[PDB]
Amino acid sequence: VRPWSEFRLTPAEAAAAAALAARCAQRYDETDGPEFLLDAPVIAHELPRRLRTFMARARLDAWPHALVVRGNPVDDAALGSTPVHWRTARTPGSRPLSFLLMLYAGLLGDVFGWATQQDGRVVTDVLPIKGGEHTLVSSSSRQELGWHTEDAFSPYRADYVGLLSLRNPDGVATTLAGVPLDDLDERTLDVLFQERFLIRPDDSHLQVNNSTAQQGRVEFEGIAQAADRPEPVAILTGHRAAPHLRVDGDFSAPAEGDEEAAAALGTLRKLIDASLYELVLDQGDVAFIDNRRAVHGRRAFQPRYDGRDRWLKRINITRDLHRSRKAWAGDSRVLG
Ligand SMILES: NC(=[NH2+])NCCC[C@H](N)C(=O)O
Ligand SMILES: [Fe+2]
């Protein structure tokens, strides 16, 4: 029994999916281009039927924290060495696998990026960056990436976060936790449903973690506003018996002087820490983390810096792009 839903491709199914992604990589210039963004959800209809059935059904189940698809081949020789930075990470060896993640994502929803994160890319990279071991962003290593809702600060945050493991030779775990409903008392639960908490943007939206450009110039103003003047929001929303979750372990606080909110948040921290569990994304595994049901993070690890570090491709997915239309910055697909 597992708190996520799991699908394992047969070799033939895995090969057919890989072949489809390879065809897309031949026919489109880029994953993030207007053309593939629009076409991917229709091309995805050609994926193996058993996989399409799993994705359609598992998305509608009440319980899972993630949807995990195992068994995509990745040839390390063809893939090439892990890049030293996300900037240079669009390597030819990783291209077909970026197309594959996009195709799988297109079965779940609408993909998007942020003007203020990795130069507005839709398919982003997770890999350790030398000098950045003890930071609060996903290019950390030696410091654990604390649990979080992705883009917790933003009402336009993803419904699902998709991750494809290109390599993970030493088996570093992703961490997950749901709402600790078996332990939250009714008074604490009540307070977490109230608009008594502050959630600021995480460090991935800072200018210094993007390139020199205007690849998102004005959108950094909105990040500054969310950082300087956060509006009080609720941590829990929806059904009391199955709440949705909005929290960041390192970027959340109580509203100013609100000691009851503080107690509720401190209790939630304790209960999430106590229930956090591990999911190891082995090479070729894809996970879609439900960013409303669960928080996620990543265990501390010693980086290699020898060309074979852990490397994921990542994508933000929403069930409805039109929810974020106020933030439609560089078209509908790059928010801020
Ligand atoms: N410690 C944290 N809460 N970090 C948030 C990290 C999330 C961000 N999208 C990143 O990839 O870096
Ligand atoms: Fe994350």
The full set of domains in the chain, from first to last, is 1-336 (3.60.130.10)
How many whole angstroms separate alpha carbon 68 and alpha carbon 309?
A: 22
DSSP letters along 11-50, please?
Answer: HHHHHHHHHHHHHHHHH-S-TTSHHHHHHHHHHGGGS-HH
Q: Which of 168, 187, 132, 137 is nearest to 283 (CA)?
A: 168
Here the tokens at position 116 are 């203020």
Q: Which ligand 1 atom is at minimum distance from the Cα of 124?
A: 11
**Is 174 known to sit in a ligand binding site?**
yes
- Is 239 marked as a binding-site residue? no
Pocket lining for ligand 1, CB < 6 angstroms: 136-138, 145-146, 148, 150, 202, 204, 248, 250-251
Can you tell me the distance from the alpha carbon of 90 to that of 104, in angstroms, rounded to the nearest whole number? 19
Mutate to test the pocket of ligand 1, among 116, 139, 140, 202 (most ligand atoms within 8 A of CB): 202
Token pair recorded at residue 75: 């040839």
Q: Which atom of ligand 1 is found nearest the CA of 145?
A: 1
User: Contacts for 191-194 with beta carbons within 8 Å, 24 or more apart?
Assistant: 191/260, 191/261, 191/263, 191/264, 192/234, 192/235, 192/236, 192/243, 192/264, 192/265, 192/268, 193/234, 193/235, 193/236, 193/237, 193/240, 193/243, 194/234, 194/261
Phi, psi dihedrals of residue 294, rounded to the nearest 5°: -140, 150
Cβ atoms 124, 118 nearer than 8 A: yes
> CA-to-CA distance for 277 and 271, rounded, in angstroms?
12
Q: What burial letters (b/e) apply to 152-161, b meaning 16+ CB within 10 Å?
A: bbbebbbbbb
The amino acid at 162: G
Establish whether 271 is an annotated binding residue.
no
CA–centroid distance, residue 27 to ligand 2 (Å): 31
Please provide the distance, in angstroms rounded to a whole number, between the alpha carbons at the two ends of the chain.
Answer: 40
Asked whether the beta carbons of 44 and 106 are under 8 A apart, the reply is yes
Residue with tokens 């609720």: 234
**Vertex 238, ends 235 and 240: CA angle to 5°?**
90
How deeply is 9 buried, as exposed, middle or buried, from its count of CB atoms within 10 A (0-12, 13-18, 19+)? buried
The helix (H) or strand (E) run that includes residue 245 is strand 244-245
Closest-CA residue to 74 (of 299, 278, 316, 310): 310
Question: How far does the centroid of ligand 2 lie from the alpha carbon of residue 26, in Å?
Answer: 31
Reported resolution in A? 1.3
* Cα distance between residue 327 and residue 311, in whole Å: 29
Strands 5-8 and 124-126: unpaired
